């Protein structure tokens, strides 16, 4: 029952200190389970999925767009840029910047993707054009991770991001080669081993993007191909009242366990 899952999520949330948002879509019957599904949460690095997908859309009609070299200037470096810092005063392709933003959550690469889309408003505009009316991106890295309570900048709801994640990876928001590329990048993420993945059996396939930021904000959005059933889309947002709160990736694993076991 969806409701059993709710009680367990609510109980999880009380023990968490913080505020939990969940949104599951089960594509076997298109059922939805929601916990705080229409409450806004700071998106942090999970936003990078939208930036990369928007650039992929651009590439549907600028054929060679992803192989074009983009200059990495000293002014482009931000804190936590493990991939791009190794290319300062050099070049990366929008493909390499996509992979770095998605699979290592590189913030300099994210800012390059945002810049390629014409700024925060350019990412938001792509969300609007795929029917995501809730997503809003308002700032660049790394200041978009401030996750200040009650600030609607750089937020979405779990319901909106699960709907959009399905659109991008299993629906028709992107072209076929672009959709495959996006799914290949998410499946190759390196930073989500302790989040949703750690709540799921290892035989299941997972494409995911983690997020982290201020106020102990710990997020994950995933696409999940279990054995023996249609894929699932699971969004797990978590933030805390203290600005210096510690990340709680285990809480997201617990949320995913609750879901894999009860649905």
Give a verbal description of the structure.
- The protein has 263 residues and is an alpha+beta fold.
- It has a single domain, classed as Beta-lactamase (3-Layer(aba) Sandwich), CATH 3.40.710.
- It contains eight helices and nine strands.
- The protein has helices at residues 2-16, 48-59, 94-103, 107-116, 120-129, 158-169, 176-187, 249-262, and strands at residues 19-26, 31-35, 41-42, 69-72, 90-93, 155-156, 205-213, 217-225, 232-239.
- Strands 2-1-9-8-7 form a five-stranded antiparallel beta sheet, sandwiched between helices. A two-stranded antiparallel ribbon has the order 3-6. A two-stranded antiparallel sheet has the order 4-5.
- Strand 7 (205-213) and strand 8 form a beta hairpin.
- Helix 1 (2-16) packs antiparallel against helix 8 (249-262).
- The radius of gyration is 17 Å and the shape is globular.
- Pfam families: Beta-lactamase2.
- Its EC number is 3.5.2.6.
- One of its GO terms (molecular function) is beta-lactamase activity.
- This is Beta-lactamase.
- InterPro entries: Beta-lactam/transpept-like, Beta-lactam_cat, Beta-lactam_class-A, Beta-lactam_class-A_AS, Cefotaximase.
